[PDB]
Paper text:
We additionally solved a second structure of UBP from crystals that had a distinct space group (P21). Interestingly, these crystals, which were twinned, had four dimers of UBP in the asymmetric unit. Two dimers were essentially identical to the initial structure (C2221); the other two showed the same dimerization interface, but the subunits had undergone a ~10° rotation with respect to one another.
Author numbering:
A (entry chain C): 1 to 66, 70 to 110
B (entry chain A): 3 to 111
The structure:
Amino acid sequence: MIVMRVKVNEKQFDMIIDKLKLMVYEYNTKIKEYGVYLKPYHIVYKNSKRYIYIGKYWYKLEKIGGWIYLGKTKPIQNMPNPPQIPESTIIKEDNEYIVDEKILYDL
Amino acid sequence: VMRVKVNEKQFDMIIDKLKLMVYEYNTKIKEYGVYLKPYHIVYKNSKRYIYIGKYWYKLEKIGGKLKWIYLGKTKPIQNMPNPPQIPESTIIKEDNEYIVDEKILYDLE
């Protein structure tokens, strides 16, 4: 398959995240009694870049300290089946700045 | 060739040189309760504006939290030592960009 990777801005990225949050709002309040939460994405900083993975990422209610991440496998067998979430990777581009050349005299 | 594009690392270079330019001046004027921050970040028009110039602040006790209050762009007190020459310029942070699969773009409306 020829899979297309294209460039989008922050606002277009925001709608992508918002849509995923909308698609799992139907699931999380229903399964809130199980102490489990389904996050449709995962943000991780590798290779000096912000990686935003898309998928099924689960959480479990904490006990005491001083919501824990369970990974990608569903915890409870007798929980209702989650909605279908697509799997993809988003890589944030390096930040760019419009700069006057004069103030580059700090060399 | 006035205005060009630099990425994050060179942007952090310019920020640090300004902070170093005022570090020893700020230590001298610490007793006055006055801080010269050599830049000003404005999030106007959904974009990170960073303005190069003199920005003076001062310290006071507001409810016990010791909050910084903006003073202006000039020396608040006549008998303070003169500041370093901070240039005047504007830096615009470009809109954040992302590489995304086109399928989830179509499949997420």
